[PDB]
């Protein structure tokens, strides 16, 4: 069944929580992490439902 | 594990001044403003001058504790020619850089801090950024925060400087406004 024979493999069992992890750069800078990531660069899509998709009125057709 | 040291007294002290406001500029650049904020700086000092009292209550906003020097162009004569502060373990003096001859001299800012007797000198008139160390001395020009204009320079640079002292290191960040995204280098001091 499982790739691993193995019944334990977990590295954590439980995971943590936080509300916000905010980074630091230098005195003045409460940024969110001033990371080059802007729309120059493009993220990998991973989304099931987006604008891709559309619906029609049954009802309409 | 254990704690390095028992409690942290380490301390940021904005430095700036030359603003010039309103006489050549009206206002520190726009994503300046953003970088500072109230409640991230216990101390801030000023050496150009302000020189309307306008700007004195914007910085009063960012810190309570603030030291400001009287400039070649401060309305209120009320302001010091010059006055020294001690921040935890670095005893630092201040001055506008007017009163130095000649005005950017580093030899003439030496001989002054003889008389001062302070491990760091703040000073500017020259609107032009200067951080480097001599005979085991610091010397730091924060130049000015609005870029105002020079006859002396024809292209200036608007910056500001914020010190971290944790005790009796203290490392220096410079923010210049080149382009429009902001650069900042790091420049660490230490009394040994
Ligand atoms: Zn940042």
Redesign the pocket.
């Given at each position: 069944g499982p790739l691993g024979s193995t019944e334990e493999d977990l590295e954590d069992a439980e995971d943590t929580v936080s509300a916000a992890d905010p980074e630091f750069?230098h005195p003045l800078?409460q940024?969110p992490k001033?990371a080059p990531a802007q729309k120059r660069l493009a993220k990998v899509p991973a989304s099931g439902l987006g604008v891709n998709v559309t619906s029609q009125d049954g009802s309409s057709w | 594990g254990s704690p390095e040291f028992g409690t942290r007294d380490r301390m940021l002290v904005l430095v700036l001044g030359d603003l010039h406001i309103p006489h050549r500029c009206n206002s520190l650049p726009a994503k300046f403003k953003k970088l500072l904020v109230p409640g991230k700086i216990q101390h801030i000092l000023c050496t150009g001058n302000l020189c309307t009292k306008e700007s004195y209550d914007y910085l009063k906003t960012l810190a309570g504790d603030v030291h400001i020097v009287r400039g070649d162009f401060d309305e209120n004569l009320n302001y010091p020619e010059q006055k020294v502060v001690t921040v935890g373990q670095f005893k630092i003096g201040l001055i506008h850089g007017h009163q130095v001859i000649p005005w950017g001299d580093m030899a003439s800012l030496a001989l002054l801090q003889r008389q001062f007797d302070v491990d760091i000198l703040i000073s500017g008139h020259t609107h032009k950024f200067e951080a480097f160390e001599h005979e085991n001395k610091f010397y730091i020009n924060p130049g000015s925060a609005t870029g105002a204009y020079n006859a002396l320079e024809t292209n200036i640079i608007p910056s500001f400087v914020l010190m971290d002292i944790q005790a009796s290191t203290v490392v220096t960040y410079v923010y210049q406004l080149i382009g429009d995204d902001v650069k900042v280098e790091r420049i660490e001091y230490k009394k040994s």
């Open positions: 750069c800078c940024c001033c | -």
